[PDB]
Amino acid sequence: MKHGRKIHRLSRPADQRRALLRGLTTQLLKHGRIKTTRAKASAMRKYVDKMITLAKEGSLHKRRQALGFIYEKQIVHALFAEVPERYGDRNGGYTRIIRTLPRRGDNAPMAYIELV
Amino acid sequence: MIQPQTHLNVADNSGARELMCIRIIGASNRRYARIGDVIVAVIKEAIPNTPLERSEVIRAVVVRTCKELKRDNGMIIRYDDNAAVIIDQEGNPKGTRIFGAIARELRQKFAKIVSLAPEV
């Protein structure tokens, strides 16, 4: 009965869950700050952090590993060039969750996610 | 894990080719019989000219099973077949030869079976 089961569903099937996390991850990486729900945000910390971690070891292999993910070549080339300079010190936890006011037309709880 | 209506190969040369289980004996209200237990079976086919004809209710004892019996050692033992040996009544099987391979757990209650076995 969900004992020791840890996975953020996002109300969806696995079709669309990975589709969400992927696209959200892309847009977040692109813009640098996004407004979304608390759950859509709080689930997203495994994948942004995984991809920044993936951008430490900039090698043929790891770029393809990341490039299967993002579905936008020119964002993932921004990383690898960017990351090791502006995150070289920081050891994990590259992501901040600020939290701001429910959405109007459904009392949906709301948040900001952006790079730290 | 042999139960009512299970088809069971015969591991000796009493003549019967294949059995079908119709009851467990010993420890009533038992769901199914694992290795060591005695069952009742109808013979579903035999070699033509043997004494044990087809369609006869007879006792057998289960020796090969697909459902891992366990030692206290910790070793477990599957087989690839569910097969019993046609017991006479109390003691030995009818044939004077047993095939396949069989476990040590059998030798406490069925001394004569592990006497005749090839590879125990």
């Binding site: 004992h3 | 050692n73 910790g74």
Partner: protein, 219 residues
């Protein structure tokens, strides 16, 4: 109620396969300990109406406790702790407060111990899983599958009987598993090795006290 010795608090730490020089493979629960099992209060026929000993467990920073509990433990002159549990005995003396309970010295192996503890919580669950009901047919057009079927009889009883088995919250409750072998007492590590299973996942409290057979208690 009246327990056959003084018990000892403890913590579950998973299961081990424990061998012996025969080669008997035995399943076992590793049980660890945390600061104390220190005696706290002693109750008497004199003042309190019965004989009993209260025993704390598990050390804390003393901000996480409340004033009253701080007082109750600081009266005994004892480390900050949660989980004061009692042990009602017939025997009363030699349990004066601020006295540590040596689990090593108070059991002595091959004992058969009775372990309580709160179980795994399975939430609100159905008639099948809860009370070992059977389910109805799957095909032959049965619109009943998993259910209670009928509840009661008819107009004569004219109501549902009290304690009629129904869907409800199964689990998260105390159950004494009693008579369990002590396989090994690790002097080094302060860790008791008990044969078999024990209520709850790794973490739970356990009230570890000796066999409570009817030739040990009160005729």
């Amino acid at each position: 109620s009246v327990d056959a010795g003084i018990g000892v608090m403890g913590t579950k730490l998973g299961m081990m396969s424990f061998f012996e020089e025969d080669g008997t493979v035995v399943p076992v629960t590793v049980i660890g300990f945390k600061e104390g099992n220190i005696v706290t209060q002693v109750k008497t026929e004199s003042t309190d109406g019965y004989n009993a000993v209260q025993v704390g467990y598990e050390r804390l920073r003393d901000r996480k406790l409340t004033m009253p509990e701080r007082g109750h433990l600081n009266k005994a002159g004892v480390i900050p702790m949660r989980h004061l549990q009692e042990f009602r005995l017939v025997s009363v003396d030699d349990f004066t407060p601020s006295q540590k309970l040596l689990f090593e010295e108070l059991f002595k192996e091959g004992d058969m111990v009775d372990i309580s503890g709160t179980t795994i919580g399975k939430g609100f669950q159905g008639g099948i899983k809860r009370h070992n009901f059977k389910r109805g047919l799957m095909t032959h057009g049965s619109k009943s599958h998993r259910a209670l079927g009928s509840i009661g009889a008819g107009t004569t009883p004219g109501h549902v009987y009290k304690g009629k088995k129904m869907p409800g919250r199964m689990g998260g409750t105390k159950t004494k598993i009693r008579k369990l072998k002590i396989m090994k007492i690790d002097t080094d590590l302060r860790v008791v090795m008990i044969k078999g299973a024990v209520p709850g996942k790794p973490g739970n409290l356990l009230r570890l006290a000796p066999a409570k057979i009817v030739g040990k208690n009160i005729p």
